[PDB]
Amino acid sequence: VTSNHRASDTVVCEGRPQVLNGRFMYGDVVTLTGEKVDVYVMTQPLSGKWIHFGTEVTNSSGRLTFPVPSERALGIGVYPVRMVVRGDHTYAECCLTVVSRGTEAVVFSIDGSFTADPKVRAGAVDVVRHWQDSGYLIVYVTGRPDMQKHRVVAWLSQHNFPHGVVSFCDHDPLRQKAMFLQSLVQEVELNIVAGYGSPKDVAVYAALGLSPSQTYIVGRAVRKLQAQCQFLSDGYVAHLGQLEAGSH
Ligand SMILES: [Ca+2]
């Protein structure tokens, strides 16, 4: 019945082609195939005024790829995006983040970093907020399908987690996470300087090229992983203290 539309938070380096993606489903029992969707960008992020950028048609799997015209390409900043289904005026929302080349970022694996509605680990929000206030782009990744974005984002907003680029899976979640982060590093030209998560994430970060100094993992240390990461045995609050007195 009710629409369950999702639009991908898109991060892109300046000057580079800007491409927005979305998927449009109802109830994903129903797939919105072959329907016109209008793409809006709030080019003045605090104005509340939407600008129609163009229109695209969803494919057989309800997906949408919309290219931002070069004449309308957005400068460095974060811009709200809304994709409206013309047929019933339902919509999805996501942010377009345009960054300067070599922008430094921090990755958090949502379930493995933040959970213990699941309860939130103590001091997690403050660590993320610390990284953002220190000048780092926040990137949230999760193995969950974007079908659940509506629930995930809400959770993130409930605990007042800082605004960041949120990325969701379709398949193997680890290959997707690894390759996605790789695409951030090579095609978006981000400088990922630290990765957070649970033990299963170590491999992923290792695949990115992150050193064990830069890989923070929750829960007491595990011997197989011994030289592959830093364990946050004492918790996020303690970790925050150890960040604040510089350790990174
Ligand atoms: Ca969650």
Side-chain angles (χ1 to χ4, degrees), residues 17-76:
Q18 306 178 341
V19 176
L20 308 175
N21 291 277
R23 197 180 182 194
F24 301 87
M25 300 300 180
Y26 298 90
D28 299 358
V29 298
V30 180
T31 297
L32 190 76
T33 66
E35 294 284 355
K36 293 185 184 186
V37 174
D38 295 290
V39 181
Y40 297 89
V41 183
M42 192 176 295
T43 57
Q44 300 92 358
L46 300 174
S47 69
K49 183 178 179 180
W50 297 105
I51 304 296
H52 187 258
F53 261 49
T55 310
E56 284 290 341
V57 180
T58 58
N59 60 22
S60 156
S61 52
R63 287 189 179 84
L64 181 104
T65 301
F66 172 80
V68 176
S70 41
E71 40 273 14
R72 293 187 107 121
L74 287 136
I76 291 177

Side-chain angles (χ1 to χ4, degrees), residues 1 10 25 34 38 43 48-49 60 62 67 69 74 91 102 107 126 129 137 156 163 168 171 202 206 211 230 236:
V1 288
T10 300
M25 300 300 180
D38 295 290
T43 57
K49 183 178 179 180
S60 156
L74 287 136
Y91 60 82
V107 182
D126 295 330
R129 189 155 303 272
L137 173 64
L156 289 175
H163 291 299
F168 300 90
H171 209 110
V202 171
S211 75
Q230 291 189 66
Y236 271 132

Side-chain angles (χ1 to χ4, degrees), residues 110-111 115 118 144 155:
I110 302 176
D111 302 304
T115 59
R144 301 162 176 253
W155 186 85

Side-chain angles (χ1 to χ4, degrees), residues 197-203 217-218 222 225 231:
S198 62
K200 76 188 184 298
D201 289 308
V202 171
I217 305 301
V218 292
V222 186
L225 293 173
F231 292 95

Side-chain angles (χ1 to χ4, degrees), residues 24 34 44 88 114 141 146 158 180 208 231-232 235 247:
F24 301 87
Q44 300 92 358
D88 64 356
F114 301 145
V141 298
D146 50 25
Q158 169 174 2
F180 168 74
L208 267 176
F231 292 95
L232 306 185
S247 285

